[PDB]
Design a protein around this motif. Structure first.
Motif, PDB file in Angstrom:
ATOM      1  N   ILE B 115      57.097  25.402  35.650  1.00 57.18           N
ATOM      2  CA  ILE B 115      57.451  24.651  36.116  1.00 57.18           C
ATOM      3  C   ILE B 115      57.869  23.215  35.096  1.00 57.18           C
ATOM      4  O   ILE B 115      56.299  23.673  34.870  1.00 57.18           O
ATOM      5  CB  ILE B 115      56.736  24.491  38.023  1.00 57.18           C
ATOM      6  N   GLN B 116      58.644  22.993  35.168  1.00 55.50           N
ATOM      7  CA  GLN B 116      58.323  20.813  34.647  1.00 55.50           C
ATOM      8  C   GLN B 116      57.107  20.451  36.493  1.00 55.50           C
ATOM      9  O   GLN B 116      57.927  19.971  37.148  1.00 55.50           O
ATOM     10  CB  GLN B 116      59.183  20.587  34.190  1.00 55.50           C
ATOM     11  N   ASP B 117      55.853  20.037  35.685  1.00 52.39           N
ATOM     12  CA  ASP B 117      55.326  19.185  36.326  1.00 52.39           C
ATOM     13  C   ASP B 117      55.523  18.035  36.529  1.00 52.39           C
ATOM     14  O   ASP B 117      56.909  17.823  35.924  1.00 52.39           O
ATOM     15  CB  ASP B 117      53.487  18.698  35.920  1.00 52.39           C
ATOM     16  N   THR B 118      55.122  16.625  37.028  1.00 53.14           N
ATOM     17  CA  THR B 118      55.712  15.083  37.779  1.00 53.14           C
ATOM     18  C   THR B 118      55.679  14.903  36.088  1.00 53.14           C
ATOM     19  O   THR B 118      56.748  13.868  35.738  1.00 53.14           O
ATOM     20  CB  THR B 118      54.886  14.767  38.612  1.00 53.14           C
ATOM     21  N   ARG B 119      55.046  14.794  35.259  1.00 57.76           N
ATOM     22  CA  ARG B 119      54.889  13.867  33.875  1.00 57.76           C
ATOM     23  C   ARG B 119      55.768  15.013  32.645  1.00 57.76           C
ATOM     24  O   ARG B 119      55.236  15.195  31.966  1.00 57.76           O
ATOM     25  CB  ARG B 119      53.932  13.884  33.315  1.00 57.76           C
ATOM     26  N   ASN B 120      57.215  15.708  33.387  1.00 59.72           N
ATOM     27  CA  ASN B 120      58.278  16.158  32.281  1.00 59.72           C
ATOM     28  C   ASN B 120      57.019  17.556  31.396  1.00 59.72           C
ATOM     29  O   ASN B 120      57.680  17.095  29.849  1.00 59.72           O
ATOM     30  CB  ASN B 120      58.811  15.542  31.308  1.00 59.72           C
ATOM     31  N   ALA B 121      55.958  17.255  31.925  1.00 59.84           N
ATOM     32  CA  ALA B 121      55.731  18.784  31.272  1.00 59.84           C
ATOM     33  C   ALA B 121      56.120  19.925  31.468  1.00 59.84           C
ATOM     34  O   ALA B 121      56.695  20.438  32.447  1.00 59.84           O
ATOM     35  CB  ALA B 121      54.012  18.341  31.081  1.00 59.84           C
TER      36      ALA B 121
END
Lengths: 97, 317, 97, 53, 53
Positions: B115-121
């Motif tokens: 999944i992509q976390d809040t900081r577009n990681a």
């Protein structure tokens, strides 16, 4: 198919836990010493040694094998049952016997 | 409505757990952590369980475009559209709720959920799982045919009802975090941050307690105290990677979302063979296009049975 | 026995006895981590599925087709069926006619 | 595991330049077990790898 | 370099011989030598449950 239930370890560090035996199928309870858990973000407790982990695991039937089990019957005696057709005069009938 | 189905998750939360891999061969403590793959459907449909929650936003509200992924000490919100459960190929997600994803991955050895976390990681966990689905029947086809038989194969229902199956729960442990403690030029300050951090300070006698505010015990050093939050509001899911608290398994009973049901299932009918008659024997021209079975038994007395997997054109007699 | 058929044996689908000899053994966690490692022989039932062998459906003598739910062997072509018949005179026909 | 290796970059004019050669890549991890992904509880043995530095 | 340990075999004792229920989950190595004189060595790659004696 079995399913291995593994409760989360009870790491009573800065102390000493004891092997609390149980009676679950193939139940296993092990107590360790000199163990230093390292939960994310740093150590798990202020002690440097003298810590215990009460690891435990036990077998249990799969969550679903009312649908996927394999019976193991033991058959001893047979019992015939036949469907027969008879044609005399004109009856053209079939019966189960 | 579905809101009733989510009344249980109001008291739960995602957690951070060990992964041992994140697509780069490195220990992670990743927020996403696959716990157990549960392939049990004859159809073939993995039920990956991982340390997160889909369909519930950070504010404990139903939303089919939000993912509660643990981070630090507070929950976050990650766009669901960045879900990439993919083995050697790329699985097609068949719906999700809570902790359980549904997939139809192609053959492979490893399972990767990201999944992509809040900081577009890109947070991901990759575990070994020898997935090799074998469709029901006698022909190991690949894609459904159009004209074929209808035999029963059990699959995981999309219906997110309540099932007899249960997953255990227990209150989270006291998470440690050295960032809370900070030196203050010979003194130490602990940022409460709306938490209930505890301390077993060895700096000075009697420095033990559970401060609920920004306590600022002075005349101490960083390596003289052990700070750890004591969050007890929500619940975690009995993870083997999460040391349980002292309490013995309060045993919350969040229901497993997706049940298993008996449904029909399509299967092709292989090419009819070209029989060639002969003296007391036949010679079949088997013409398969994918591994099929072939078994002949002499229905006399003490038969001469046989059973083999035909993979290419043969001339069995 | 662990590994082969019936490493897990329930007395009935609904009963809970679960003789579960499966060689579930624990091991000390590696330093700096909080796993609970174990070394359990795989599902014995699953291994039975892979190595089940030729099912009776494909080697029944006398071409006996096998069905399962009320387990039975159909169309078994063996032996003779003695038949005894009691007939009323109405069925027969008079010689003079 | 694979048979060919392809490397591509996006040039100025939003196009995809790429080179693809034949390379029979098939890495087998060190030790006596040809596992795929790292385990969690396991032995530790020395295997050489390129340093990121 | 990490590496897993395969599941321990299920030993079956016998008259001057043993039967092992190897239960792999990925290709492992299995070799046994009779530590006497002029041994009878052996080494093979197992990919599925076997019954080596």
């Amino acid at each position: 198919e079995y399913k291995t239930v593994v409760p989360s370890p009870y790491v009573k560090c800065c102390g000493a836990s004891e092997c609390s035996t149980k009676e679950k199928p193939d139940y296993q309870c092990k107590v360790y010493t000199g163990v230093y858990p390292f939960m994310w973000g740093g150590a798990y407790c202020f002690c440097d040694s003298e810590n215990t982990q009460l690891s435990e695991a036990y077998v249990d039937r799969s969550d679903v094998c009312r649908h996927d089990h394999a019976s193991a019957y033991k058959a001893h005696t047979a019992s015939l049952k036949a469907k027969v057709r008879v044609m005399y005069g004109n009856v053209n009938q079939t019966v189960d016997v | 409505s579905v809101s009733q189905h989510f009344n249980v998750y109001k008291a739960t939360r995602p957690y951070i757990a060990y992964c041992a891999d994140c697509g780069a061969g490195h220990s992670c403590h990743s927020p996403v952590a696959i716990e157990a793959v549960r392939s049990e459907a004859t159809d073939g449909m993995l039920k990956i369980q991982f340390s997160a929650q889909i369909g519930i936003d950070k504010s404990d509200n139903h939303d089919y475009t939000k993912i509660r992924y643990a981070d630090g000490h507070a929950i976050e919100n990650a766009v669901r559209s960045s879900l990439k459960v993919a083995t050697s190929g790329d699985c097609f997600v068949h719906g999700t709720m809570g902790h359980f994803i549904l997939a139809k991955c192609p053959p492979g050895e490893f399972l990767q959920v990201s999944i992509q976390d809040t900081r577009n990681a890109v947070r991901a966990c990759r575990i070994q799982y020898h997935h090799d689905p074998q469709p029901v029947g006698r022909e190991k086809f690949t894609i459904r045919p159009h004209y074929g038989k209808e035999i029963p194969c059990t699959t995981y229902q999309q219906t997110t009802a309540e099932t007899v199956e249960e997953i255990d729960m227990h209150m989270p442990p006291d998470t440690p975090d050295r960032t809370l403690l900070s030196q203050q030029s010979g003194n130490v300050k602990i940022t409460v941050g709306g938490k209930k951090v505890k301390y077993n300070c060895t700096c000075g006698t009697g420095n033990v307690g559970t401060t609920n505010s920004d306590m600022t015990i002075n005349t101490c050093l960083i390596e003289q105290c052990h700070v750890s939050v004591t969050d007890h509001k929500k619940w975690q899911f009995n993870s083997p990677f999460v040391p349980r608290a002292d309490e013995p398994a309060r045993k919350g009973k969040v229901h497993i979302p997706f049940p298993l049901d008996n449904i029909t299932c399509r299967v092709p009918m292989a090419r009819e063979p070209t029989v060639i008659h002969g003296k007391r024997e036949v010679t079949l021209h088997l013409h398969p296009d994918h591994p099929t079975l072939f078994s002949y038994r002499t229905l006399g007395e003490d038969p001469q049975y046989h059973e083999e997997w035909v993979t290419a054109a043969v001339e069995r007699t | 026995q662990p590994g082969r058929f019936g490493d897990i044996q329930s007395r009935t689908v609904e009963s809970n006895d679960l003789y579960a000899n499966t060689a579930l053994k624990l091991a000390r966690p590696s330093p700096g981590m909080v796993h609970v490692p174990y070394t359990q022989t795989p599902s014995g039932f699953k291994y039975w599925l892979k190595e089940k062998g030729t099912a009776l459906n494909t080697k029944a003598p006398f071409g006996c087709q096998i069905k399962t739910n009320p387990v039975r062997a159909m169309n078994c072509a063996v032996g003779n069926i003695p038949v005894s018949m009691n007939l009323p005179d109405s069925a027969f026909t008079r010689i003079v006619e």
